[PDB]
């Protein structure tokens with residue numbers, strides 16, 4: 291089943307690349323209708339980046355959650 | 360740059376999972392407007408599957424080619 295290839299990929303994509311900033315925590319994310327938005331940082335490091343004034347790691351990658359578009 | 364995280368992922372996704380049927384050739388694919396469609400089989404095994412009457416591996420996974428949806 292093709293939807294499961296996509297789901298297992300997202301599961302892996304999410305797991306093997308932690309927060310770009312602290313490198314250990316997993317990334318923040320949310321579901322935005324038909325896509326999964328994976329933010330570049332965990333929530334702790336994102337808030338911290340505002341405080342310290344660094345917007346270098348700000349960003350996200352959206353992933354279609356289904357196999358067919 | 361976020362578009363590049365998506366591109367490098369697709370590059371990897373495409374490379375580490377060859378044809379589901381013969382297991383060596385890389386998969387067929389095409390660009391369908393804003394998505395990359397990765398078919399489950401290379402072209403040789405897909406045509407062959409019609410000939411032998413097996414539709415078990417028929418299918419594809421579409422991937423949004425950009426970071427933002």
Ligand SMILES: Nc1ncnc2c1ncn2[C@@H]1O[C@H](COP(=O)(O)OP(=O)(O)O)[C@@H](O)[C@H]1O
Nearest residue numbers: 318322327329330331332333336347348349350
């Ligand atoms: N945890 C995070 N790590 C990195 N960047 C983030 C994080 N949370 C938000 N951002 C960035 O801040 C902005 C807010 O995004 P978001 O709230 O998803 O947009 P929208 O409100 O349109 O859904 C975007 O640039 C997003 O990439």
Ligand SMILES: Nc1ncnc2c1ncn2[C@@H]1O[C@H](COP(=O)(O)OP(=O)(O)O)[C@@H](O)[C@H]1O
Nearest residue numbers: 387391396398399400401402405416417418419
């Ligand atoms: N190389 C291949 N491997 C596996 N399945 C395939 C392959 N080529 C086509 N198919 C399947 O046959 C059908 C034809 O798909 P496609 O021509 O992409 O649709 P469309 O013409 O709407 O763009 C779909 O079920 C597709 O998944």
Ligand SMILES: [Cl-]
Nearest residue numbers: 353354422423
């Ligand atoms: Cl996707």
Ligand SMILES: [Zn+2]
Nearest residue numbers: 309312332335
């Ligand atoms: Zn972090």
Ligand SMILES: [Zn+2]
Nearest residue numbers: 378381401404
């Ligand atoms: Zn093959």
